[PDB]
């Protein structure tokens, strides 16, 4: 993938497609 | 976090992979 950017939904919708789903850590709070 | 590491610059979904339960 080029220019693979990924911010605010990029950062869910990435991991949305590379995790298919069950789940993800796209953040991290405390 | 992964967002600057992924916004600052752009990572690989190789790495997201990594943040999938």
Sequence with gaps: ?30 | GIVEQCCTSICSLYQLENYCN
């Design chain 1, 1 to 30: 993938f080029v220019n693979q950017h990924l911010c605010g939904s990029d950062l869910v919708e990435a991991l949305y497609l590379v995790c298919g789903x069950r789940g993800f850590f796209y953040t991290k709070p405390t």
